[PDB]
Symmetry: C3
Subunit: 661 residues, 3 copies
């Protein structure tokens, strides 16, 4: 409701009831005398269409007490608050107001400025920068915003809480800079403008495709449920480079939120399609509870600190991601320090086009991309095209001969860096590459479970390292020419579960750990497919061997130097008669002529209650008897007699007759 | 406020005079209001606030003030307007194209831009009124008594609903049409009714099992127990008849229902007799539940019996307590290959049914089953029934088809390809079964079930793999049950059995008749192991360290022969005492159902010789097994040892071996 | 911008065009007659300086129609809502306005008050109490606030969301009281004013210092990268008490946020320097996602409930802390109930000056400081000066003879309270004292991993307790006179991994658990360094012993009561000839005269296909033969004959001739 009123002011005298006819008005700085030029401020006629014309002072008051310019009634305005002095035609002062704002003070605005939460919203601004400049505390993203690649926003060092309720859409990087420590960005949703060509190298039954032509046949234009091919696919799927159409090669679609050179910024509940998150030269930043962004061409979550100080304080905490052409979560040139201040905790990666979690190896540009002292715990990687966890620091194939910006090779050889990562409680399932890969010297690794992988379970280029409670369960299910677990260097493994339900008959070795000392293997492993430097159970208690569904129980010995495929000796218990007979025989055996159990001593065969003793089947040579005060029975066929080669207590030999007709 | 004179006066523009008998025309902005087509309504506004519309022009009196019927009046318009003033001779005194452009209150413009939008329930009579007014935030700042089925339409808006007071009522408060990304934080649901609840555990936290004892715990409370259900009639046989009618068939729950929404998260929820229902939702999460105390229905339910299969639905973090049925439950959800859904980082205490439940069977005429969910990093303590119930098929009537699911002819009962990602789960105190599941082709890892009155695990699984399972002091009530049962042909790699409680009062520890197992650790009674095959194929060089009084033992047992008697053994026994430097080694075999009946010894009494058992009477031809061996036997009437010799050529001869 | 107007009011007549010369104005309550003094309200002259002088009515109008007071023009002010009556010089009413506000009504405040989020901010108030009193919903800390020790703020029972974007700066405690249930405090940053002297008992290669003089040598003034010495350091580094200068002793610097006697308050994403967080007398409070506060003199996170009801519902959830002089997270007099409603889940502690997580022991003040029914799960403690987890309830050194406020010693002996904590999935690395310590009766503990600790791995003063899947891997690496794991009482251990890659030759026992029954040891343990009451593997299947790196395989027996260092017998398989000979011999041995393997029976030595049988090297005594229907061969040297001591089937002894020339 608008009340009818008379907005145009009139100016009347102070001691009688008259207009200030032919008077003058001066307008100036608050609490000054505006009659003096130095104190005057710009005054403008304001026109109906909202245009302005600056005029000179004094303002002229006509005979009716109204302001006029060249005799025409005008509306005068000023940019800021002002003092006002009114003079009559004789030049006597009629009135003076030091500050006109003080006459009609809007008290509500003082109260409102104090009692309401400050937030600006993108719907009120043409550009994101405009909103950012206006922001004091909150910034609401409340309209879908088309950004251009490289669009850069300066947040002015302010500590902002950016609440996203709409998308940032575009191909390329949206770059946020100069956010103050403590700033948070919640609910951000990045989406590419472009819909790329993607491959989907898995079937409707979730089996991995390995054939290049089969993979090419999956090409579709989509922002999800697949990934844009990269040059690593040319290696992963031999022959695919030639078979892909040109429009499916060299694509580069990612919509990336880039946090540049900020400290103490967290991105919470991020999501998107063809989406990427890049922390470039950041410290003490976190990607928290990622809400399953579907990846594009670049890493989904990247902490890259190739320039400036080594990254520290950078974490992926919770959440999950899906797809992407390369790794889900990756680090370059981060060092958590002794305090292990950084890494990946509580994270899930699904279907990384490369690996679920990656610490980069080798030189990138002019310097090291490697990482030290990071945590990798309580995390899960499922169905990566390459690796579950890739925690190596030195290049496997075609390694550099040096490490600019890192420890020289002369100090630490390749794969022997003191990486010092805290690695515990990780699960990997469905990896096509390697479930769990790493390198380094002096590493402690615990509670790692790798299961149901088409590719190898683990590939460990580690040295003087300790692995505790490792489970490698049905890996290399495609039976590639690979081990299920490989360890290069001289390591200790304490607890190693091998074999689920899949046969290893179509594979090479299960564990190849030629310099490693191992204890506590469990599972239905084919002992011929074990290679270690040493295997021992030094600390077992009293033992029982329980046999089910066989007529015997066995405690066997296998000397791998003699033979990896044949037991060299055994202690058996064998049933006499059948079930419930109350009788069994015990048998001690030795291999001869590569025939297991060729020679044996028996106790209670056929419940006879006696020992059956093997004898030498012809004349025994002197050197057949080993120890003093022992005898060795032997056969003399021509007299149908048993003889005994005796090594007497004094060590001398004598031949006796033992049994005759 | 400055004491001012609000009533306008209108004076002329050429000389200082009132516009006596002047005329004012009021119309559309930027038009000529003298034209009636440009005029807008003008009203007298009375002191009591009533209005009366009058004709134009407005009349100015001798004093320069607007008048109607000889009285000074206040005139108002509904919109911004043009104003033209004419004097008694029709000369124009003034023209204002838009009176609002003279000094607009610029504050509302700046305020609307700089402040966060939020409405609050204290300003509205109903929750719908508040939802309608909301733009960004909605604050629940007063307790609100809802009626069952009360339905709120949020208009597709992406709202941040902050709760700092209670929703109070029996039944469901139903939220609908929230936009993707909406969040509801701190919600507290509380029933109006205080029901009758049972508390089937003692002040020393032992479960009660006697129906009469449980009935004796009846009290009216919204917590520290649960409303009896139909399942209690089975759990406590006879309780149905002993419970008074007022304790039976109660249905008190105050439920926040999120209906048919996508991308809604409920965070830090709590309450008393509280439930949370996501009905026909996708990509919704129950996050960091702040220990709501449950009612009759499930505490957290993702139910997708209608519409598309549920996906993207999770319980993440938090905990719940009590409730008559399961704490967290799923019907007709499929996480896809991506495993996009399930329960991670969750704790359940004292579920009246189970901690985490995936429904089995048909419900509402379709499948209630679930696929491809995660169950990880979660803990369930003191459920009345199960810790985790992750089965999909009902363990009965294997003929029955699965409407809405895989046909029974494609996948038999309990052999669905459920494909859940199950890892790192802990259960303690279950009265029913700690960990239960079915399915074919399952992988399960890092499960620990300890200190359970009921069985540790009940696995109706087929061609499945279990890695690093620990079942420690379960079936502590000594029900006629196993500690772990596995029906189908599975592999177990790493199974820890037995804590500090004796199994002397129990039947089988593990009954897994089709399963192949390796790596059992613990003081299991070997008679209480039943498996298809047990083996340690990959041990290294071995040492058996005995802390016993005078011996160490490596025993053999053939379960086909006897489940309770060792069939043979390798012993080492001390000669003399501690520090003697001497022991004897002994190889034994069972005969006449007497373990160790027959043996060969090396170094008995430090004699440095081998004591060899001989057949105590004439040896039959078939007593000797292998060629180039001899078997000593006794001939009493010559006080001699003979030897039955099987020569190298396989033929038998009998020789004299020792005589007087 | 601002329009030029004439703010000073003029009062003119209603029926003719004249000023109300020498008129009178009355001002009173809305919709009343203000000429009645009962209805009048205060009116004020507002001077130019903004000051006010109350005057009595009526207001006086001059010949110009303007308000005057003793002949000077004046600005009169009063409350928004009022009635106004104007009278001419004759006392005739000129006008009456029932309610001046109703003329040009501000509708905006009504709309604004409904549509905007309420938050007050510290920049608008001189003191934190001022802001707290003004708050309704939100409270923003947008300026650094210097507090004094003991400064107490009462939040009126209001449910407040306190968002911190600046620091609370001060030595001592800032005390928050009377927060309503559901209140939350986010991003708080406590910082001390003092930079104290701190010690840093670790080197640049992250080796612990143990020498007092070396530790004193590390003294520096800093708020981080070390801690203030306390009296426990006197014990930890013997001699340091006398070597520290006075300025480094008795320091007491912590900047502590104290939440006092509140219910349902959560502190989220807290940080700081020399910072502490104390919940005193609270219930249902949480310290969530601690953002690596760097600690001071007192515990970093403390739930202290020594008065009032036992603490319940109090958790540390997520996050991490660093440094501090004492423990990172600690509890006094909390009981989670059967519900286990409280504890530590998901937490990381680095470099606690005492322990990572501590449940207090003994009497504090006049009552129990102990704790029951708490969770300790999914947490990690790295590099504590004392313990990783200290979950004991009873005092170790000079214990109390009683437990005021708790169970009596007569009901539960020392170290044997039914603490009932839910303990699972814990990792400790780098502890200088004890990695994992506890006491209690009836405890269940599972999935504990302790690795690479200078001090002992575990010290368990527990009884009738159960430990499942424990790993103690390279602990006591400094070779203190200690065990790697000690357990005092009658416990069960099911799964125990011992030994990483470090030799134990410099140590005493690896496990000393004299009253415990243990199964499932894995690792390269020295068997002489195991002490338990009972060690057994009752439930193994068929067994194979696989030997790598040797010409033989072994299944050995050791009777620890006979000898802890020498095996008492063995079953061996030994290669005959070369590798790939396909022949081996089996040997069964027994110790004699303290020489392992002194006496043995062989099968297939030198591939001879016969059994080599040891005989008594002199005349056998009657008592040498054990069982009926057995014979024992023995040597009669004078005649060059083997005889047999025969125990006939009827048990009677006879001596026969077995072999002669
Ligand atoms: Ca003879």
């Amino acid at each position: 409701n608008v009340v009818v009123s008379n907005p145009r002011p009139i100016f009347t005298e102070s001691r009688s009831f008259k207009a200030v006819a032919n008077g003058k008005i001066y307008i100036g700085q608050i609490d000054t005398d505006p009659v003096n030029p130095a104190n005057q401020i710009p005054v403008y006629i304001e026109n109906e269409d909202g245009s302005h014309v600056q005029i000179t002072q004094p303002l002229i008051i006509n005979a009716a007490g109204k302001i006029v310019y060249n005799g025409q009634l005008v509306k005068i305005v000023t940019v800021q608050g002002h003092s006002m002095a009114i003079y009559d035609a004789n030049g006597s002062q009629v009135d003076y107001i030091a500050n006109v704002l003080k006459w009609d003070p809007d008290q509500y605005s003082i109260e409102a400025d104090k009692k309401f939460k400050y937030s600006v919203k993108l719907s009120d601004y043409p550009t994101l920068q405009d909103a950012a400049s206006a922001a004091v505390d909150g910034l609401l993203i409340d309209r879908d915003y088309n950004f251009y690649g490289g669009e850069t926003v300066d947040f002015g060092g302010k500590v902002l809480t950016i609440e996203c309720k709409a998308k940032f859409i575009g191909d390329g990087n949206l770059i946020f800079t100069k956010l103050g420590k403590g700033s948070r960005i919640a609910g951000v949703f990045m989406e590419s403008t472009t819909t790329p060509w993607v491959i989907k190298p898995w079937t409707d039954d979730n089996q991995w495709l390995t054939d290049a032509a089969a993979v090419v046949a999956t090409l579709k234009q989509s922002k999800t449920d697949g990934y844009q091919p990269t040059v690593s696919d040319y290696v992963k799927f031999p022959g695919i480079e030639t078979l892909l159409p040109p429009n499916a090669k060299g694509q580069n679609i990612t919509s990336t939120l880039e946090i540049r050179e900020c400290i103490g910024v967290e991105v919470h509940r991020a999501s998107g399609l063809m989406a990427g998150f890049l922390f470039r030269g950041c410290h003490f930043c976190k990607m928290v509870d990622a809400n399953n962004p579907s990846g594009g061409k670049d890493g989904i979550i990247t902490f890259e600190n190739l320039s400036g100080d080594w990254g520290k304080g950078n974490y992926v905490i919770g959440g999950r991601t899906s797809y992407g052409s390369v790794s889900s979560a990756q680090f370059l040139r981060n060092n958590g320090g002794f305090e292990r201040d950084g890494g990946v905790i509580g994270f899930t990666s699904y279907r990384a086009g490369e690996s679920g979690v990656k610490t980069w190896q080798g030189t990138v540009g002019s310097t090291t991309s490697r990482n030290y002292n990071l945590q990798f715990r309580d995390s899960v990687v499922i169905y990566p095209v390459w690796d579950g966890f890739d925690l190596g620091a030195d290049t496997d194939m075609n390694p550099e001969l040096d490490r600019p910006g890192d420890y020289p090779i002369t100090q630490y050889p390749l794969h022997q860096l003191p990486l010092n990562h805290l690695i515990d409680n990780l699960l990997v399932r469905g990896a096509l590459g390697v479930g769990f890969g790493m390198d380094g010297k002096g590493m402690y690794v615990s509670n790692i479970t790798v299961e149901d992988c088409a590719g190898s379970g683990a590939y460990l280029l580690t040295h003087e390292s300790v692995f505790t409670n490792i489970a490698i369960i049905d890996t290399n299910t495609k039976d590639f020419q690979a081990n299920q677990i490989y360890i290069s260097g001289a390591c200790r493994v304490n607890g190693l579960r091998l074999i689920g339900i899949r046969s290893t008959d179509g594979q090479s070795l299960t564990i190849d750990a030629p310099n490693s000392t191992v204890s506590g293997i469990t599972g239905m492993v084919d002992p011929s497919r074990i290679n270690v430097a040493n295997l021992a159970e030094e600390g077992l208690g009293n033992i029982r061997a329980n046999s089910f569904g066989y007529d015997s129980a066995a405690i066997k010995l296998r000397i791998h130097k003699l033979s990896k495929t044949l037991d060299s000796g055994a202690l058996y218990s064998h049933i006499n008669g059948g079930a419930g007979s109350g009788s069994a025989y015990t048998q001690l055996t030795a291999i001869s002529g590569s025939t297991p159990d060729a020679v044996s001593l028996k106790v209670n065969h056929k419940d006879c209650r006696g020992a059956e003793i093997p004898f030498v089947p012809d004349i025994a040579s002197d050197d057949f008897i080993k120890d003093s005060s022992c005898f060795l029975p032997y056969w003399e066929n021509n007299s149908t007699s048993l003889k005994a080669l005796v090594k007497k207590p004094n060590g001398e030999l004598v031949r006796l007759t033992l049994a005759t007709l």
